[model samples]
Target: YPVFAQQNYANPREANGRIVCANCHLAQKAVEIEVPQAVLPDTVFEAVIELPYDKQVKQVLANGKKGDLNVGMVLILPEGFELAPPDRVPAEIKEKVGNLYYQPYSPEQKNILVVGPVPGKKYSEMVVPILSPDPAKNKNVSYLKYPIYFGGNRGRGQVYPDGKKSNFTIYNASAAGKIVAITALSEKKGGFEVSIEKANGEVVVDKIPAGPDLIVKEGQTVQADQPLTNNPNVGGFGQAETEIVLQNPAR
Candidate 1:
């Protein structure tokens, strides 16, 4: 589930400053963010997230079908910064935001917003409105510069939160050998167990889950660590950060 990050990691940002999505995503990509250098208290401002990628590429779906990739994001805002109230959101910002909803990472972490696994084709770029806190009324909120952290991803994760491999990755042969047999899974569950006959007369079988297509045929020779299946993955994860200042009206 896309909410796996929220359930597994209470704090998305590690002590060393790495976002937890990278642990399961396992691939690197570039992302960009645009925010106002400074914002006035109690005002709404826009933060634009840029997630660039090849729109033509399709990824392996969970049901073994090829489909367009989905994108998700976690935006860690400074303390007291939050999604703007519906009434406070202007018409232009409302049109840009559309129907997309943003929720906090957790109830206790209201400053952190999370959105999507929404279609990447439509959401390659997203605009969000945030309301800055007023320093005079909110004792904890101050007029100072604070850093914003963001993590974004497109497509499914290669691994699950439990460390089990998902069908979105390539599988490699376990040993160097001649392919002996390839047995498909029964009842249409969709996978295969391939038997390899080694030189030492040892027969080893490698199990492959149902997402990647098999690249080698029976009687084909394979080397250790050779790719047995194609990599159906076309997307990866990325993170970027920038600072925003909560300007004091008096200053």
Candidate 2:
């Protein structure tokens, strides 16, 4: 969902700003459906709703859907993403196990049917199930083929809330390694810094120049063998990272 806020840096200082994820990706607000408490156990119920991107122009008028940019856009999952566990369930369904469901949207097809909880019966209380977007499933859609760019003076970059001067720490879990790749993209000129550290606190830094179209390619393995110290940074191009694995390996 954070990806929806990514900004376009073409005209960084404009009052209204440039295009973003919502600009084209037509995702509707999470649709909450009430289920009769009785049918909450074994059967899976899907919520098939339509998100009209053509209608969004009424709200985001400045960036009216561009030519050929219709109401249909693909929804793809991000790479190497995960969801946290929930704390509680309704009393009526306390004895029932929760199983989440996911599906992709296609322009070739008009509607998206987001599957929810398995079915059970208890008409007394209404059960509300929250569905979190899975990055793996999110990326499988057709529209996500292009890397959505982020970061910089006018863009949405990583926010170091503590301040840029503070000692920044990188986590091993964030290593991403061969699983993910990230590149910086900005119109401004400057040195960019990238560091990789082991769980024990070892650090490796690399500086890469930003060109007209800087690309950080995804590989099967993290380039640990490559030079990782005192790397210089460059500027001018956009940066982004990609995931080598965007779907279930078994699939």
Candidate 3:
């Protein structure tokens, strides 16, 4: 006669999130055995040892809020494995697996303001202001002017127009993500340009012919790509030519 084993409960819905019989036993379709049992009088026995949650707790506590958090755990895995660890492993491990569980990839937050003179229009000067999340340090801002259209016939020269100031101060507020607002002020106007760069001295983003006017009323926030309709030289001036320029941070 065959030995009879006690039958377990038929439906164990109560064990939904917290506990389940399958937690200790393999449940994959490839695993034929419902439970792995050791034979009586077994001479040689192999036991799989897994670390408790305590060991992982120390690692979790040491991890900072930035970069890859799972790099340390991947280094902790043992040499060779015939089978992967069971899903019953500690919650920390489950939470740290894959990119989903690792630190997110976030680009640096740096706001840059570019302000300068536009090229090629008679007596009138122009100012275009551009904003970017990246900025360059220790270098003059780069502006783009093509076909010599708006200001005077100055062939693509950097506008260090006197009285023009580049104002930037580091903001430590959560709402302001490393912002730097740039503005170019000029008494004379014809054409203008603006651009931004990364901290590594690379141009991150830029806008040209930001518009034909450098005069913005105090306390005004302008949207990108929207021509300064209030300024006649921007949208379209009598016979003045206009062009748009876009730039990315150099590697």
Candidate 4:
């Protein structure tokens, strides 16, 4: 069983208007993310996250609400990737977390750095390392994404684009190296993309326009207060599995 299976549910930044870091910050003004010249797949490397957004700005939520932009910011690690612990996020303008010396993001939430951007400072840079599971088992595993809902009554139900109430799947770095290529499976409707890192990265499968024809939805819980559902959504974050050879990257 995967470790994340029993993980607590939380609304991804997507629920609100904060789809990605770029949502609040202008990409044209500045790219949402920046990385080194080259990264080897299945290998670890560092990336400098720089954005020109003035720290004084506020963040708008999905429901047209305003929250502390500094605190509201999050680093939503794409699937096939993960981040280091809270200690990984460094503070520049402020000294310590909120204790006066503190300035920006604290470890207020999981995966989110509460302090946000430090005034006049570039966003923090961090590593992209850590692979998971046995490649053999993962080789043929299902890659899920997005969601119609988690419908936990009280939770981050929507992970995928739609408001479906269940965890969608996606894949990890199975092969060691940079992205070679990505192709859609005509067999079933799905979209896919290849590695981001020069050395290694995720296969960011796009949304399945045709919808959830292949979703093996979660059944009723054997014992629980949770709502039992198998109803399907019109569409989901696209997902699929296939073997490949990781070779030299082109452009």
Return the top candidate by lDDT: 1
RMSD in angstroms, candidate 4? 23.0
Clash tally, candidates in order: 0, 29, 26, 29
In TM-score terms, which candidate is top?
1
Sort by lDDT, best first: 1, 4, 2, 3
Candidate 4 segments whose C-alpha is farther than 4 A from its true place: 1-9, 13-31, 36-41, 54-72, 84-251
Q: What is the lDDT of residue 231 in candidate 3?
A: 26
Residues 14-112 of candidate 1: C-alpha lDDT, one tens digit per residue: 998899999888788888899999999999999999888899988888887788998989999988899999999999999998779999889898899
Which candidate, 1 or 3, has the higher TM-score?
Answer: 1
Q: Which candidate, 2 or 4, has the higher TM-score?
A: 4
TM-score for all models, in order of appearance: 0.92, 0.17, 0.14, 0.26
lDDT of 4 at 53: 38
Residue 61 displacement in candidate 4 (angstroms): 19
> Candidates' lDDT values, in order?
0.90, 0.26, 0.20, 0.27
lDDT, candidate 4, 1-251, per-residue tens: 01121122243334443333222122223223433333333433333333333445433322323333221123333233333324444554123222312111223332222222232222222222222122234453223331111100101112433323222222233333333444443545442333222233343222222222332122211221212222222111111111222222345
When summed lDDT is taken over every stretch of 10 residues in candidate 2, the lowest stretch is 230-239
Off by over 4 Å in 1: 186-190, 220-224
CA lDDT for candidate 3 = 0.20
Stronger candidate by TM-score (3 vs 4): 4
Worst 10 residues of 1 by lDDT: 183-192
Task: Provide the RMSD of all predictions against the true structure, rounded to 1 decimal.
Answer: 1.9, 21.7, 32.9, 23.0
